[PDB]
Design a protein around this ligand. Sequence first.
Ligand code: ATP
Ligand code: CA
Ligand code: CA
Ligand code: MG
Lengths: 123, 365
Amino acid sequence: VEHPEFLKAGKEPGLQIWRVEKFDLVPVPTCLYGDFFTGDAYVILKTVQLRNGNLQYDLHYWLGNECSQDESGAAAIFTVQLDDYLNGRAVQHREVQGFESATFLGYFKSGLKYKKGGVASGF
Amino acid sequence: QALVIDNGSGMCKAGFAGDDAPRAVFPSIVGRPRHTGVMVDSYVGDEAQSKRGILTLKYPIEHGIVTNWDDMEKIWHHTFYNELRVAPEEHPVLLTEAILNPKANREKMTQIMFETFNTPAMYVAIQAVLSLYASGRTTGIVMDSGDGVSHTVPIYEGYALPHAILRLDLAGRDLTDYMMKILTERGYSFTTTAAAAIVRDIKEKLAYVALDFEAEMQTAASSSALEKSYELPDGQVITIGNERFRCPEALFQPSFLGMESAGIHETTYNSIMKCDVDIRKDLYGNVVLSGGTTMFPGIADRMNKELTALAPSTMKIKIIAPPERKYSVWIGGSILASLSTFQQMWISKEEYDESGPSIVHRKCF
Ligand SMILES: Nc1ncnc2c1ncn2[C@@H]1O[C@H](COP(=O)(O)OP(=O)(O)OP(=O)(O)O)[C@@H](O)[C@H]1O
Ligand SMILES: [Ca+2]
Ligand SMILES: [Ca+2]
Ligand SMILES: [Mg+2]
């Protein structure tokens, strides 16, 4: 995958977030990290550096209550593709609005927020 | 503009990547003259079935596997030209395959698309994995039940676990046969050419899976409250009673069909149990049902109940059975073939000319 966003992924410790927008993976502006459209699906990559300083990858796809099937489906498939791209080293996690893992909720230092709406289905 | 084709044993589903449903669904049937040369070649789909009186009818896909390549080409030709109405040389084509599709078959399918159809690009995807994706998951167990065979396919992080796949040799065709039989014994007689179609429709319109089978058998013996009327093509109305839920019961009790095999609940359990202990919680929590033969009302509640009984009392069990789950495979393909990363997934004509059909084992898995 020559997907320009894949080239940018998992370089240094931290957090990257993309939104599924009409069958593509579009980066979220860093200033909007943590405000999730409940009508959308998102791909989140958490790069941690251990004490020996080896890279560690957790890959979360987050499904809004009102995301359409193409959006949730694309987020699943993009997750797999990104994982293959990262040589199988990312642990994959399905995160559903209202039921996120504590780990995922931990990523967001002022608490994640939900908001209605978003980008329309690509179907 | 990519095309998606899901070649079922019974029904072929075809359409345009980006659509949320197949544009064409037709019987996977090729019809040829019995007596060559005496009356004014071949027919596919509903037409084969209409003219079946004067045709030898063949089904090129058995258990998901192609058993006849000349007939398969007729199906695809009819798909491109009569159903979708496209020039196939202008469209990347995504095709589906069964679990354990033989190596030679995947090669032949690739060769046909490039050499006979001149497709510019193609990709082969596994059906169960497409159903999982359509449900917005990368890990889960797919119970796929269509025409001739049901399969339980554990999938972890985007890929099937081949060692844990099991199969029950009972699906929709068996359930139609069995609805005929039990309705015949009730006193009815299905004698016309449209016998199979009538009983099939009774099955699709009125069968349901009972949560508690003996409670339901009792309810039906002592009351008329479960009974339904069904109008035949000729206008005669017949009554359907316990056949409604006894018919799909055979999925859970294959002995009804004189079979040794374990039911679908147990096949599913057994598949989960063939998998690394660490992932089983994620299989039980994501049991995805797909195919026509999973369309019975009640089937998800019944699966939940049966798996609850088999799994440790603290297992979270979740059954995922959305209303469109008949075309889940197709819809997963529509999504996949629409992705911006799919142009880099497919075998191009250029790659095929360079590598020939064996490219399929390196590009598609
Ligand atoms: N609403 C329904 N209730 C029960 N059964 C149904 C319903 N709709 C369709 N079926 C049955 O589904 C069966 C075929 O479904 P499906 O199209 O999923 O199989 P297929 O894709 O052709 O087969 P396979 O995947 O096995 O090669 C038929 O036996 C049909 O009667
Ligand atoms: Ca949306
Ligand atoms: Ca991984
Ligand atoms: Mg099928």
